[PDB]
Amino acid sequence: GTYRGRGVALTDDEYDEWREHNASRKLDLSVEDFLMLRHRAALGADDNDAVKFRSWWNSRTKMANDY
Structure with a gap:
């Protein structure tokens, strides 16, 4: 995956x-x-903030997991 804090630009x-x-x-x-x-x-990783993110974001988008 990407990073964090280091001026992260994240996937597009x-x-x-x-x-x-x-x-x-x-x-x-x-x-x-x-x-x-x-x-x-x-x-x-299944930290609740992340999981509730998952639940919400995966009902709609389901992201582009660092792609």
Whole structure:
């Protein structure tokens, strides 16, 4: 996967789609946080924020797991 904190630009879609994540989940989250949520979901970590991200994002998009 990508990274976090290191000026992460993330894969092309998901970063832009994070701006949508901000909208849809009615939060005001930074990309790093997003990248984590998707990271865990995509890769194989099940931290609840990431799983609730998964649930929401995978009913609609189902991302582009660092593709």
